[PDB]
C-alpha cells in the first residue's frame, strides 16, 4: 500500500511561488493564483490580490 506525503502548502503572500521539478515518485506541484486564505484571527496575507 502506498503513502501521499503532503507538507504544509507554501502560501506566498504578495508574491508568485515557483514550482521546481523534483525527482520524487508521483511528484505533483501546482501554483494557484488569486488566493486569499484565512486563519482563526483573520486573513493570513496582507495583500487582497
Amino acid at each position: 500500500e502506498y503513502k501521499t506525503v503532503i507538507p504544509s502548502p507554501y502560501v506566498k503572500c504578495c508574491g508568485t511561488a515557483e514550482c521546481k521539478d523534483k525527482n520524487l515518485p508521483d511528484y505533483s506541484c501546482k501554483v494557484f493564483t488569486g488566493v486569499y486564505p484565512f486563519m482563526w484571527g483573520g486573513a493570513y496575507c496582507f495583500c487582497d490580490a
Binding site: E1, S8, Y10, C13, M39, Y44, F46
Partner: protein, 334 residues
C-alpha cells in the same frame, strides 16, 4: 518531546451541522492498515500532556484561540455511525475500535463546556480475520497472523515531520493610532503584512507602528519560532525560512501479532453415489469453501442459518473447509 511541540488549530470541513471551522480537534490522517480493525487517528490536539509540558493521562491540551489550554481526557470521544471504543491515547494519536460507518468524528469538551468535534468522510467496514464473522474476541481459538497498533506509550520506530508554526490570524492585535496602524505584540511573535509603503514585513517580538495606513489594509497573525508543529497540509508553511524540517518519534506503531479466532461444530454427514450431503447448523456466519484434480473449481459461500449442502465428490477427491475447522477430505469408493 512535548516541550518543543504544541497543539494547534487547523481546517476541518465539518465542525457540526456541515459547517467548516478552524478546529482545535482537526483530523489530519486516519490509518487503517491493522487487519484486526484498529484505527490509528491523527488529531491537531495533544492527549496526555498538560500546558506546562508534564505528562498526565487524565488531561488533554488543545489550542484555545491564541494560547494552549487544558481539557479533560474523559470528555474525549470518537464515533463513526455510533460511538467507538478508545484503546489508547498519546499526543496527536488515538487508537479506536469503531463499528461500520461512512464518516469519522473526534471531539472533546473545553473548560467552559462548549463541545468541539471534527467530522471527515471515511468508509469504515473492517475485513474479516479468518473465515468467521464474529462480534467479541475469544480467549481460546485458532492463532492467525494479524497486524495491530501496539497499546504501548513508547515511541521508537514510526515518525512524523515537524517544523516552526505558521500564523493564527488575530485582528485584535491591530488598532488605529490615531488614523494610523498600531500592532501590539503582547509578548508574542506576530507576522504582519500591510497594503502600505515603508515597512510591511516580519515576524516581530516588539510593538510596531505603520504611519498613514488604514487598519483594513493590514493583516496580523500570531508569530513564533520558539515552538514546533506537525508538518500539516491544513496549516500554511513558514514563508521566511526555506524547507527547514524536524522529525519526532510517534506512539502506537503497526506490528505483526496474533489474533484469536473462534470455531464451530462438525456437521452431520451423510453419503451418496459420488456425492456428500452436509446438514450445516451455524451459531454465527460461517465460511464454507470447497475444491476438487486438474480442475479444482473453487467455490465459497457464507452460511448464515440452517442449510443442507449437496456436493459432488469426484474420483480425484474433494476438500471441504467449514469455518475455522481443519479441511475435511472426501474420496469415492471403488
Amino acid at each position: 518531546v512535548y516541550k518543543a511541540t504544541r497543539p494547534y488549530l487547523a481546517h476541518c470541513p465539518d465542525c457540526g451541522e456541515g459547517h467548516s471551522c478552524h478546529s482545535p480537534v482537526a483530523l489530519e490522517r486516519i490509518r487503517n492498515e491493522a487487519t484486526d480493525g484498529t484505527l490509528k487517528i491523527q488529531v491537531s490536539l495533544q492527549i496526555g500532556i498538560k500546558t506546562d509540558d508534564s505528562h498526565d493521562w487524565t488531561k488533554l491540551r488543545y489550542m484555545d484561540n491564541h494560547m494552549p489550554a487544558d481539557a479533560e481526557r474523559a470528555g474525549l470521544f470518537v464515533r463513526t455511525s455510533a460511538p467507538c471504543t478508545i484503546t489508547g491515547t498519546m499526543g496527536h494519536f488515538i487508537l479506536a475500535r469503531c463499528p461500520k460507518g461512512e464518516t469519522l468524528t473526534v471531539g472533546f469538551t473545553d473548560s467552559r463546556k462548549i463541545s468541539h468535534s471534527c467530522t471527515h468522510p471515511f468508509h469504515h467496514d473492517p475485513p474479516v480475520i479468518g473465515r468467521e464473522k464474529f462480534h467479541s474476541r475469544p480467549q481460546h481459538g485458532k492463532e492467525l497472523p494479524c497486524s495491530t497498533y501496539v497499546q504501548s506509550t513508547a515511541a521508537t520506530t514510526e515518525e512524523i515531520e515537524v517544523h516552526m508554526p505558521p500564523d493564527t490570524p488575530d485582528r485584535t492585535l491591530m488598532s488605529q493610532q490615531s488614523g494610523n496602524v498600531k500592532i501590539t505584540v503582547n509578548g508574542q511573535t506576530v507576522r504582519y503584512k500591510c497594503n502600505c509603503g515603508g515597512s510591511n514585513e516580519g515576524l516581530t517580538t516588539t510593538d510596531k507602528v505603520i504611519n498613514n495606513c488604514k487598519v483594513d489594509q493590514c493583516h496580523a497573525a500570531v508569530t513564533n519560532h520558539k515552538k514546533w508543529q506537525y508538518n500539516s497540509p491544513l496549516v500554511p508553511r513558514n514563508a521566511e525560512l526555506g524547507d527547514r524540517k524536524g522529525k519526532i518519534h510517534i506512539p502506537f506503531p503497526l506490528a505483526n501479532v496474533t489474533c484469536r479466532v473462534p470455531k464451530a461444530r462438525n456437521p452431520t454427514v451423510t453419503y451418496g453415489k459420488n456425492q456428500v450431503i452436509m446438514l450445516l447448523y451455524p451459531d454465527h456466519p460461517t465460511l464454507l469453501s470447497y475444491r476438487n484434480g486438474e480442475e479444482p473449481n473453487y467455490q465459497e459461500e457464507w452460511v448464515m442459518h440452517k442449510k443442507e449442502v449437496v456436493l459432488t465428490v469426484p474420483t480425484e477427491g474433494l476438500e471441504v473447509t467449514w469455518g475455522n475447522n481443519e479441511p475435511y477430505k472426501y474420496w469415492p469408493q471403488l
